[PDB]
Short mmCIF file of C-alpha atoms in Angstrom, two decimals:
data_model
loop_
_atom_site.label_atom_id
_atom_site.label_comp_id
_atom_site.label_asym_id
_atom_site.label_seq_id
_atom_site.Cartn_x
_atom_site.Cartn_y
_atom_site.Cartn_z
CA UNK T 126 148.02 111.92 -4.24
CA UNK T 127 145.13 109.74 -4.39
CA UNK T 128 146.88 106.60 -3.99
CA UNK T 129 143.88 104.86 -4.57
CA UNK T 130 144.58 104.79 -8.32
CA UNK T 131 143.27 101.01 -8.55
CA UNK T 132 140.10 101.04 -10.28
CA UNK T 133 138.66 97.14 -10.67
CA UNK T 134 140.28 97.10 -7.07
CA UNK T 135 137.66 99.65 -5.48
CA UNK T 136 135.08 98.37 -7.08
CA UNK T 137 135.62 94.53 -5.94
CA UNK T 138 136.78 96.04 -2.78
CA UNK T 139 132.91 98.28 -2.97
CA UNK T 140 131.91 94.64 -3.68
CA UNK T 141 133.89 92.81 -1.68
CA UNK T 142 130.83 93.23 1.16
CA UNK T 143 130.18 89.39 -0.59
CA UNK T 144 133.88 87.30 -0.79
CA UNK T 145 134.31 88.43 2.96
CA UNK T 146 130.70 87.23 3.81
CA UNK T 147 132.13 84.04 1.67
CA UNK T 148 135.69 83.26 3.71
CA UNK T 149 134.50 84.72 7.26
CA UNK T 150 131.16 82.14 6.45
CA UNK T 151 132.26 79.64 4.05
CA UNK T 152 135.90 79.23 4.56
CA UNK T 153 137.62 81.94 6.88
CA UNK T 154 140.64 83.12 4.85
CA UNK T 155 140.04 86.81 3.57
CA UNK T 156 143.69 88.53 4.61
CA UNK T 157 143.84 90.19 1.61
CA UNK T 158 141.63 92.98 3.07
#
């Protein structure tokens, strides 16, 4: 089944284009991805 039930989740993930660009420039710790 769609597994992806996690709604919030997609979209931050959809929008997580930005807190990667944040860790992999700012910091460098993004492993939740």
């Amino acid at each position: 089944n769609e597994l992806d039930v996690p709604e919030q989740v997609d979209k931050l993930i959809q929008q997580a284009t930005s807190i990667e660009r944040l860790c992999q420039h700012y910091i460098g710790w993004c492993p939740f991805w």
